[PDB]
């Protein structure tokens, strides 16, 4: 996961501090088989938690059990990510990505 974010940001300075899989491995397999059933691939979208349609924090999504965002009217950034929000105030700081 660290080399994924390093790829998306052109930065050989970013290093992961932790993670939280908010999906069971059986659910990941069910999503993989549904994607091949749709005859389409799977792309990883690295979004900021506050770039979504309604922003949620990490404590918000764990307690409420749902990420309450309408994924229909939502725009997914692929490959190149914009710098995470805040950034140019504290470049050597801690951020979050989903």
């Amino acid at each position: 996961w660290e080399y994924w974010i390093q790829l998306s940001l052109f930065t050989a300075d970013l290093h992961i501090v932790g993670g939280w899989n908010l999906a069971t491995p059986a659910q990941q397999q069910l999503f993989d088989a549904k994607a091949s059933a749709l005859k389409g691939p799977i792309v990883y979208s690295f979004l900021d938690l506050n770039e979504l349609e309604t922003p949620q924090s990490l404590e918000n999504i764990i307690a409420e059990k749902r990420v309450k965002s309408d994924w229909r009217k939502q725009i997914f950034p692929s490959a190149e990510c914009r710098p995470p929000f805040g950034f140019e105030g504290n470049p050597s700081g801690t951020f979050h990505v989903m």
Binding site: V17, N50, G86, E88, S92, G93
Partner: protein, 1090 residues
Amino acid sequence: QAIEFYWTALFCVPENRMLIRSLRDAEERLLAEVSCIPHLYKAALFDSSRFALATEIGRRGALQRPPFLVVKQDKQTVCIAEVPLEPGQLIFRELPYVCTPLTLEGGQVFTTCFHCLRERPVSNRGFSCPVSPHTCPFVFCSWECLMRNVRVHSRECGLLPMIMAAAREAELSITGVLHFCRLLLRAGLEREIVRPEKDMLYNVLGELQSFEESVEIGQPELRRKLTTLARRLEKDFPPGFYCYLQHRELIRLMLLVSQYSPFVRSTSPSAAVQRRDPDASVGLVFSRRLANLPHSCVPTCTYNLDEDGFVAVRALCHIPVGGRLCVSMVEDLFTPSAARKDIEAPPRVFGCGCVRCSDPSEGGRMLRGIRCGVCLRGYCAPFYSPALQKRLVAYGVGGAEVARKIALLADEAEERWQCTSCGNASELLSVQCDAIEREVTQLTKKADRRFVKGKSLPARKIYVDIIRRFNSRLHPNNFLLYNAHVIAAGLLFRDPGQDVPQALLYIRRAVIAAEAVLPICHREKIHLFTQLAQISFAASMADKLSRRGVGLPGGFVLEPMYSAYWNAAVCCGPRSVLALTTLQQLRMYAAALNVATPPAVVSYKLPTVGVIFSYFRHVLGRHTESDRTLRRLVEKDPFRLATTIARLGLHCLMSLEILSAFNNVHHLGTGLSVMAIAASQSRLTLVRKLLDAGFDFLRGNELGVTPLVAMAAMPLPQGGRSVGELYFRSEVADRADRDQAEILRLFMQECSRRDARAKEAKTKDQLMLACTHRILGLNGPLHFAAARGKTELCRQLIRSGWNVSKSNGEGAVPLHLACASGDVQTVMVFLIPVDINVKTERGETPLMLAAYAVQRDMVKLLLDKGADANVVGDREKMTVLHALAAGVCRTVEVQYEPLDPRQDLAAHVVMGLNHASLAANIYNRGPGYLYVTDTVEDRIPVVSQLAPDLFIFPQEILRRLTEANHIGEILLRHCDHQLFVRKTKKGYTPAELLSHLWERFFQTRNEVVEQSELRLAALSHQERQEIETGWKVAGQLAYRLIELLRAGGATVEDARRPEDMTPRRTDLQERRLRQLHRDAPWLKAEEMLK
């Protein structure tokens, strides 16, 4: 005691897992509660406001008085106090009268000056002996010392073998005698100039305490050999060598030297900034006011030898009215009680009644503890031997008459051990603990010879063997155990080795053992606390190699550096080089851990963050979190709010209210204040809002970096969008330079409002008065902008009134720093109306720095506007082709800096790993990770070897010869024919100087390739072909440039240098005239007038 009881259980059941785990838990808890300076002393260091009628004359003239009176109870030298002395208070602050280094056998010099125990200011420059100028060693360093000590060396140079053979007959420390004869010579040449009733030597004998009768009847081997030396000193010496002194009085003076002269450590200003070892030399000094103190092994004062070379003591404890002032004569106060009261010890050390030297268990420090097996709890302490005790009762109360009464009226080497828990003093305990004592002393001496001869790997192996085997048999304060901890921790951090966490153990138990034994502030606690946080940060990194969580918290890496800074302030100085270099270590480590708040008295809290999330989520862009989640950020780091606002310039009314409170605190990461970091980036709208609201714009940090200085110090932001001699530069650089010009203009109007309202406190002059410590080389704001290539900034600096010809450091004009930056336009604006030829103190022009950097359009530009291409240096005799030579093949960049960003693991973390840092040689794609490279030279213009891509890949060399050949072509038709033959300081023509440095670059090439990096091993046959074609063509253009610098000078019939010409009269007269012009500049006014 929690450590103590965990250790004995480890002796009962070894390993056992929970035993070694709860031991590690309890030790690092103990370290977390002892490695902290009090918060009031903590904020006093970072206050930053320090660096910003007849009665009244009496009040401030009396609250400055020397806080000591030399009173004379009995025969002693008891020093009393009258003023409540805060720790870190300067007391005496004198000159060293006479000093000697650690002379030793083998003909070895400590590579510093023999006189004046300092680092040499310039490594390739010095002064000379009067008697034998360049056959005698020990060259002088400065003109403050050549006037200080040239006559004491004139009397000593002929008699150096004379005194050498004296010290081997009467076996003594060679430094102990060589200091004494220097005291005889210097005092003797002072008796020539003073009247013969008062002198310092007259004061030393007669007024100082001078243990004599305690030496005759106690430790008599001290008296016999001082008699052997003095009998020698009387009969084959002139009588004026010892100031015509009696034989008995000569014995008195020889004790007066040994028992009042301390070993000082000469810290060096260049290795401090280069992160290497301080204390480059050790030796004796003597001072009259220093000798007016009583010795105590529990100090209230510690002496030092400053970098300006003044012996001074400070305050350790909180000495109130009616207090005492005491220093340790013992240079290693951690040394055990038996070796404190050694037979060879000075008499003042041998007679001392401190709690460590009277109580057998070293006053609760318990420095000699070996596991007592009778009760299997606690440790037994040794006693003084009966042979020692009989000779030692001559120094306390009436020690003289109790000594003679036993002598007339009336197992010795063996000393007893006493357990401090159950009280057993059996012969079984004194042969068991003696057996352990001899085994660990023999093992430490085995690695002592192993390390001294240089075989460092087995020296660490048997020190680690001591730490692993005996270990629980030893108390955690032993002199054998702690000396094993410090060596093995350093050799498991450097050297082949560094597994890393085992060194983290060995430096952690070292710091605990040091604080419980050594005094409250010490010179060694500067070194141990610095390496404690360094290995702690590397262990935080090695954890991030492993499972990636948190690592060690910020407390364990910052607080050891904080105590290292406080011990730097108390012991070495609050403004010395060592304290400032450890402070730059503190700020760089603070930036890596992202703490960003200096510990101060204010600590402005925000107890209503939960409502102003409309602004707090806006400044950091994070519109997600809750109440408690960033209420952590305001209590842990209120100042990161100020830095993010200052860098992301917001001009809102709420923004001005936020920054208004945070004014006096500078920073912790970089030390720039709120407005200083606001104006360092181009934030013209925020800077205007701060200045007209009354924000402070004149104070500087510890180095002296005012916000205007840091403004010009910022690199111009390059790598943006689009373009702007074809001098194109990014529009990000264009907007940054011009907005910073508006910032400097607003600084000028802000001076004008504060200076037209009234007179005095001239804020205009204080803005121009903004320079830096010599660590950065006295650079001014015009200097910083010239070195950064800021064209529009230095144009506004010229118009406002900064001097174009102002000098810094090594006599550098800002035109020198402009041509070093390589920007054409900055060079132009410095000569639009001039100093197109100009010299430094070394004697260089902007043209010779143009040829050194090897830049085509820079050499062409200077030659168009009239640079004299025939200027020869007056100190190096080095010319423009002599600068093109050895700039073709240079292996060392010379660079000013506050600390090395080359060996710090924290510098790579803070400053990053990218293309800009690789071009600045911050980190390196070399063979080793960090290690220790070639030391090159120790100069405050810190020289550093370039990256090993210059030697391996023929890309930078092949690029450099192409415009070096063209620079030689454009200089061929402009330079004369005499300069093609002129010699440098090593006797080189410009042609075969290039041939010689090409051979030296070739020798270093074969050395670097043989040691190798595995990038050379991982090379295809095509890339190896392209490298060898590259170095064949590199040799082709090297010889082509050699023939270019040689064939031009083949058409001159005169080969002799101009100063070896047979001269024509008026040139003899005028060289004598200009000599007296520089010698006596005052005769001008009397000459033209009268």
